[PDB]
Amino acid sequence: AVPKRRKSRSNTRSRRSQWKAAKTELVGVTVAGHAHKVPRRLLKAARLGLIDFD
Amino acid sequence: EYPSAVAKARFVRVSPRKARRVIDLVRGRSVSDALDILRWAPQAASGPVAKVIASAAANAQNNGGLDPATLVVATVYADQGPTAKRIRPRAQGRAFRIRRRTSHITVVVESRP
Amino acid sequence: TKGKRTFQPNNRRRARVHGFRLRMRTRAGRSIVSSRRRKGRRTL
Amino acid sequence: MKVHKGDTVLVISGKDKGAKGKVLQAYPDRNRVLVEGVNRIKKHTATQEAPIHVSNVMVVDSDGKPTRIGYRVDEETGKRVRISKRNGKD
RNA sequence: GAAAAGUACCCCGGGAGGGGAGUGAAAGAGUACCUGAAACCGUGUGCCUACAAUCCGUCAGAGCCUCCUGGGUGGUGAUGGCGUGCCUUUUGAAGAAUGAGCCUGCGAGUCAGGGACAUGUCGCAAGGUUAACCCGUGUGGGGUA
RNA sequence: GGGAUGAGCUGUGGGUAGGGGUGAAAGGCCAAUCAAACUCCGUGAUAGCUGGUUCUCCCCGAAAUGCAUUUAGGUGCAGC
RNA sequence: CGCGGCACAUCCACCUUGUGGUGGGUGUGGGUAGGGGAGCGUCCCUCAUUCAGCGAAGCCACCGGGUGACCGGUGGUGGAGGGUGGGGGAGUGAGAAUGCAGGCAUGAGUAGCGACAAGGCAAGUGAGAACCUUGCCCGCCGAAAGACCAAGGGUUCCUGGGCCAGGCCAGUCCGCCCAGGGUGAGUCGGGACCUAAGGCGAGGCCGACAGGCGUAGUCGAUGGACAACGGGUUGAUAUUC
Ligand SMILES: [Mg+2]
Ligand SMILES: [Mg+2]
Ligand SMILES: [Mg+2]
Ligand SMILES: [Mg+2]
Ligand SMILES: [Mg+2]
Ligand SMILES: [Mg+2]
Ligand SMILES: [Mg+2]
Ligand SMILES: [Mg+2]
Ligand SMILES: [Mg+2]
Ligand SMILES: [Mg+2]
Ligand SMILES: [Mg+2]
Ligand SMILES: [Mg+2]
Ligand SMILES: [Mg+2]
Ligand SMILES: [Mg+2]
Ligand SMILES: [Mg+2]
Ligand SMILES: [Mg+2]
Ligand SMILES: [Mg+2]
Ligand SMILES: [Mg+2]
Ligand SMILES: [Mg+2]
Ligand SMILES: [Mg+2]
Ligand SMILES: [Mg+2]
Ligand SMILES: [Mg+2]
Ligand SMILES: [Mg+2]
Ligand SMILES: [Mg+2]
Ligand SMILES: [Mg+2]
Ligand SMILES: [Mg+2]
Ligand SMILES: [Mg+2]
Ligand SMILES: [Mg+2]
Ligand SMILES: [Mg+2]
Ligand SMILES: [Mg+2]
Ligand SMILES: [Mg+2]
Ligand SMILES: [Mg+2]
Ligand SMILES: [Mg+2]
Ligand SMILES: [Mg+2]
Ligand SMILES: [Mg+2]
Ligand SMILES: [Mg+2]
Ligand SMILES: [Mg+2]
Ligand SMILES: [Mg+2]
Ligand SMILES: [Mg+2]
Ligand SMILES: [Mg+2]
Ligand SMILES: [Mg+2]
Ligand SMILES: [Mg+2]
Ligand SMILES: [Mg+2]
Ligand SMILES: [Mg+2]
Ligand SMILES: [Mg+2]
Ligand SMILES: [Mg+2]
Ligand SMILES: [Mg+2]
Ligand SMILES: [Mg+2]
Ligand SMILES: [Mg+2]
Ligand SMILES: [Mg+2]
Ligand SMILES: [Mg+2]
Ligand SMILES: [Mg+2]
Ligand SMILES: [Mg+2]
Ligand SMILES: [Mg+2]
Ligand SMILES: [Mg+2]
Ligand SMILES: [Mg+2]
Ligand SMILES: [Mg+2]
Ligand SMILES: [Mg+2]
Structure with missing residues (x-):
């Protein structure tokens, strides 16, 4: 099956605006005396210093 | 009304739609907060925008x-x-x-x- | 003939069928060579 | 060409009007000349002068006033000698 | 760009790219470069919009917003009515007949001939006109076949 | 799945050329094209057929009938 | 019907009573094919005139205007040509031709990312590593998924660099990009030896021409003849050094 007609701007945008990135939950951590912000699931690794902070 | 600076990354090799997907997470936030969200966004476009x-x-x-x-x-x-x-x-x-x-x-x- | 394409290269047969000496052996061939010079083809 | 290297010229058109100058080198193919002090170009380090079109300079007379020049024959060699107008010297 | 004067130096960046400086009349000319339209893609912003069936407009019309002097612009448009795309081709198409995704550019009664007919107009007029050709820097003057 | 010492398969080199070739014959094949290849040229082939033919306004404004027609979805003349 | 604007045809009265204007009547003004009439816009030329680096064209916005095509003004942008009028001339107007070229949408961040051998960990390099390097485990082919030659390709080979294109992801890697380097023969495979099919073919025969065929001859390997083995070595050649 092929598109019968081109979508209007409105219909294309209504669908397309729903393609967005999932926001990551971020929490504050303090390792080595300095503050940083990391995803919550990576807090354990952040405290063990296993997270390259860039 | 506020003092500002501009930066442009021109001809960056990422699709505009994917770049937009990753900048809609950081539009309007503080620079430090935006840098952290882009650090932790898995989308590859987060690098260039960051x-x-x-x-x-x-x-x-x-x-x-x-x-x-x-x-x-x-x-x-x-x-x-x-x-x-x-x-x-x-x-x-x-x-x-x-x-x-x-x-x-x-x-x-x-x-x- | 499954899978075998039409052009099987062989430079000796290319030269003996389309080559310069083959062209020059007939008036039609010389006409072709002069026509390609006149058009200005690099390859004659 | 009628403007050579050694002779001094006066700029008659451009930014530096009335600029006395001496031709460092002529480019007859491009019809330009390099003149001392003319269109001082401030080049970024890592200030020099850029060539100016020969139409914009007139050869000075070595007797003051600028001039157009023509030629005559010296009768000794047969060479055509560059000479001025306004009494047609040198 | 008139001229490479083609952006020294510093800063972010692995680079790319950029910012500040600097050159230039101009960088609203930065070797992706004159002018820089449209399609198309964002971002910001005013109004509307999540109980409504919409050829998408039109007329009526509140309310907001904006800019000027209750009034008038400009934007929007709750709500009411009316309202079956364009082209081709058909007796008849909104048609579920054809063609067209969009924009920009291009793409179709032209020219020749003392041709033919008819007309408008101008010159001369019982005449009119030359053709080849000849002579002239020409578009002018000759040239009766 | 068929043949697989054979009318076998296959390489290399060669020959047959377009009303011609070749065909254990299917109008098969002859460079992904074959009831006559391909390219260039005649050539801007021709098509009573289909499509398209671009700015504006003002005035008037049809026909889809007759006759004839290798004619009937074309055309001539008439009618308008 | 009322009031106002326009137009066409026709009539009547004034003004050089037809080139026709003015006023007033009267009638008329849906329209496809089609006929007739009158105009708008673009470009070029000529003549005159007038703007233009104190800013032309083109483009953009806004405000205005005309009965229409359309027009003007102002501002922005821009950087060298325009405006008006009498004429002259058109490659003179597009929305459609499954039209042509280019740019860009829609589908859509969708399908797919090319065999059903299968990857993993540690370490390294690096800005960046699922994919590159090293080691080790695991698995797969093994009448090939191994090693070679011919044809074909053409430098893809090696070294050192590179990493925005390419590789169906990424890439520090690469058959990609760049530079330099690299192929060594009396014996190998060919020629300088031989001929097959077939090709060309002195003269020749035949054919209006074009040309066809062919003798002598001369080519033409896929065949005949012909003298090298083993080992070592380079980053890259080796029956060649
Ligand atoms: Mg000059
Ligand atoms: Mg800068
Ligand atoms: Mg600046
Ligand atoms: Mg300056
Ligand atoms: Mg400018
Ligand atoms: Mg461009
Ligand atoms: Mg530009
Ligand atoms: Mg509601
Ligand atoms: Mg209903
Ligand atoms: Mg409505
Ligand atoms: Mg009809
Ligand atoms: Mg029908
Ligand atoms: Mg339809
Ligand atoms: Mg429909
Ligand atoms: Mg049909
Ligand atoms: Mg269609
Ligand atoms: Mg079997
Ligand atoms: Mg059996
Ligand atoms: Mg068997
Ligand atoms: Mg049959
Ligand atoms: Mg294929
Ligand atoms: Mg075939
Ligand atoms: Mg035939
Ligand atoms: Mg003909
Ligand atoms: Mg009528
Ligand atoms: Mg008729
Ligand atoms: Mg009418
Ligand atoms: Mg009426
Ligand atoms: Mg009509
Ligand atoms: Mg200026
Ligand atoms: Mg200006
Ligand atoms: Mg112009
Ligand atoms: Mg306008
Ligand atoms: Mg203007
Ligand atoms: Mg302007
Ligand atoms: Mg104009
Ligand atoms: Mg004119
Ligand atoms: Mg005209
Ligand atoms: Mg045209
Ligand atoms: Mg168009
Ligand atoms: Mg089209
Ligand atoms: Mg296209
Ligand atoms: Mg889908
Ligand atoms: Mg999938
Ligand atoms: Mg694969
Ligand atoms: Mg690792
Ligand atoms: Mg096994
Ligand atoms: Mg075995
Ligand atoms: Mg290599
Ligand atoms: Mg390498
Ligand atoms: Mg790469
Ligand atoms: Mg890639
Ligand atoms: Mg002979
Ligand atoms: Mg022969
Ligand atoms: Mg022989
Ligand atoms: Mg031989
Ligand atoms: Mg052999
Ligand atoms: Mg080797």
Whole structure:
């Protein structure tokens, strides 16, 4: 099956605006005396210093 | 109304739509917060955009001489650059068209309380 | 003939069927060579 | 060409009107000359002078006033000698 | 760009790219470069919009917003009515007949001939006109076949 | 799945050329094209057929009938 | 019907009573094919005139205007040509031709990312590593998924660099990009030896011409003849050094 007609701007945008990135939950951590912000699931690794902070 | 700095990353090799997907997470936040979200966003476009905000913040602090801590990405937007054109062979002798889309990413940060 | 394409290269047969000396052996061939010179083809 | 290297010329058109100058080198193919002090170009380090079109300079007379020049024959060699107008010297 | 004067130096960046400086009349000319339209893609913003069936407009019309002096612009448009795309081709198409995704550019009664007919107009007029050709820097003057 | 010492398969080199070739014959094949290849040229072939033919306004404004027609979805003349 | 604007045809009265204007009547003004009439806009030329680096064209916005095509003004942008009028001439107007070229949408961040051998960990390099390097485990082919030659390709080989294109992801890697280097023969495979099919073919025969065929001859390997083995070595050649 092929598109019968081109979508209007409105219909294309209504669908397309729903393609967005999932926001990551971020929490504050303090390792080595300095503050940083990391995803919550990576807090354990952040405290063990296993997270390259860039 | 607020002192500001601009950075542009021109002809960056990411689709404008994917760049927009990753900048909609950081539009309007502080520079430090935006850099953290982009650090932790799995989307590959987060890299280039992150260094665009970093460059804008650096311009603000070095050329503008203003405080990095009070700095917010006021307006970030990705528009389309030139698109390269490639041919991908398909079945039965058809040749389809691939588009290498590039982006121009503009960031304006301003300093404000 | 499954899978075998029409052009099987062989430079000696290319030269003996389409080569310059083959062209020059007939008036039609010389006409072709002069026509390609006149058009300005690099390859004659 | 009628403007050679050694002779001094006066700029008659451009930014530096009335600029006395001496031709460092002539480019007859491009019809330009390099003149001392003319269109001082501030080049970024890592300030020099850029060539000026020969139409914009007139050869000085070595007797003051600028001039157009023509030629005559010296009768000794048969060579055509560059000479001035306004009493047609040198 | 008139001229490479083609952006030294500093800063972010692995680079790309950019910012500040600097050159330039101009960088609203930065070797992706004159002018820089449209399609198309964002970002910001004013109004509307999540109980409504919409050829997408039109007329009526509140309310907001904006800019000027209750009034008038400009934007929007709750709500009411009316309202079956364009082209081709058909007796008849909104048609579920054809063609068109969009924009920009291009794409179709032209020219020749003392041709033919008819007309408008102008010159000369019982006449009119030359053709080849000849002579002239020409578009002018000759040239009666 | 069929043949697989044979009317076998296959390499290399060669020959047959377009009303011609070749065909254990299917109008098969002759460079992904074959009831007559391909290219260039005649050539801007021709098509009573289909499509298209671009700015404006003002005035008037049809026909889809007759006759004839290798004619009937064309055309001539008439009618309008 | 009322009030106002326009137009066409026709009539009547004044003004050089037809080139016709003015006023007033009267009638008329849906329209496809089609006929007739009158105009708008673009470009070029000529003549005159007038703007233009104190800013032309083109483009954009806004405000105005005309019965229409359309027009003007102002501002922005821009950087060298325009405006008006009498004429002259058109490659003079597009929305449609499954029209042509280019750019860009829609589908859509969708399908797909090319065999059903299968990857993993540690370490390294690096800005960046699922994919590159090293080691080790695991698995797969093994009448090939191994090693070679011919044809074909043409430098893809090696070294050192590179990493925005390419590689169906990424890439620090690469058959990609760049530079330099690299192929050594009396014996190998060919020629300088031989001929097959077939090709060309002195003269020749035949044919209006074009040309066809062919003798002598001369080519033409896929065949005949012909003298090398083993080992070592380079980053890259080796029956060649
Ligand atoms: Mg194929
Ligand atoms: Mg001059
Ligand atoms: Mg700069
Ligand atoms: Mg600047
Ligand atoms: Mg300056
Ligand atoms: Mg300018
Ligand atoms: Mg461009
Ligand atoms: Mg430009
Ligand atoms: Mg509601
Ligand atoms: Mg209903
Ligand atoms: Mg309505
Ligand atoms: Mg009809
Ligand atoms: Mg029908
Ligand atoms: Mg339809
Ligand atoms: Mg429909
Ligand atoms: Mg039909
Ligand atoms: Mg269609
Ligand atoms: Mg079997
Ligand atoms: Mg059996
Ligand atoms: Mg068997
Ligand atoms: Mg049959
Ligand atoms: Mg075939
Ligand atoms: Mg035939
Ligand atoms: Mg003909
Ligand atoms: Mg009528
Ligand atoms: Mg008729
Ligand atoms: Mg009418
Ligand atoms: Mg009426
Ligand atoms: Mg009509
Ligand atoms: Mg100026
Ligand atoms: Mg200006
Ligand atoms: Mg023009
Ligand atoms: Mg206008
Ligand atoms: Mg203007
Ligand atoms: Mg202008
Ligand atoms: Mg004009
Ligand atoms: Mg004129
Ligand atoms: Mg005209
Ligand atoms: Mg045209
Ligand atoms: Mg168009
Ligand atoms: Mg079209
Ligand atoms: Mg197209
Ligand atoms: Mg889908
Ligand atoms: Mg999938
Ligand atoms: Mg694969
Ligand atoms: Mg690792
Ligand atoms: Mg096994
Ligand atoms: Mg075995
Ligand atoms: Mg290699
Ligand atoms: Mg290498
Ligand atoms: Mg790469
Ligand atoms: Mg890649
Ligand atoms: Mg002979
Ligand atoms: Mg022969
Ligand atoms: Mg022989
Ligand atoms: Mg031989
Ligand atoms: Mg052999
Ligand atoms: Mg080797």
